[PDB]
Design a protein around this ligand. Structure first.
Ligand SMILES: CCOc1ccc(C(C)=O)cc1NC(=O)c1ccc(OCCN2CC=NCC2)c(C(=O)OC)c1
Length: 114
């Protein structure tokens, strides 16, 4: 099956917007982690493949995904980076867990429809 870029955008962008809409939980994920600004210079020593909502959105807008599972992989890369880097008591870690719950719920019916 070939998935056209606009088909993927129409189906998958609403699932990304569902993550963006989460407040407070999406706020640390709306832009790439800037380790200098945030005062966490060890970040890139631990997270080798950074990912965030704005990068995923740009990839959808520029047709960088051929298959739905590639989009899902990037969302999960974002989650796994945050669970890897952050302590389990931290805001970012617990916010990540909430976003993963939202995403699981949103992506399932969409995948059925694709
Ligand atoms: C200090 C440690 O922070 C982090 C550590 C790890 C990670 C990840 C993904 O692993 C992320 C962060 N945090 C951030 O990236 C971050 C970035 C910007 C934020 O807000 C943006 C601005 N707005 C809020 C203030 N006024 C208006 C506009 C936030 C935030 O607000 O989270 C609650 C977090």
């Amino acid at each position: 099956k070939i998935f056209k870029p606009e088909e993927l955008r129409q189906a998958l962008m609403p699932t990304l917007e569902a993550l963006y809409r989460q407040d407070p939980e999406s706020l640390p994920f709306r832009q790439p982690v800037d380790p200098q600004l945030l005062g966490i210079p060890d970040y890139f020593d631990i997270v080798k493949n950074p990912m965030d909502l704005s990068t995923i959105k740009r990839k959808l807008d520029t047709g960088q995904y051929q298959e739905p599972w590639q989009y899902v992989d990037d969302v999960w890369l974002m989650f796994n980076n945050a669970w890897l880097y952050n302590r389990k008591t931290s805001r970012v870690y617990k916010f990540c867990s909430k976003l993963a719950e939202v995403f699981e719920q949103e992506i399932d019916p969409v995948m059925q429809s694709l």
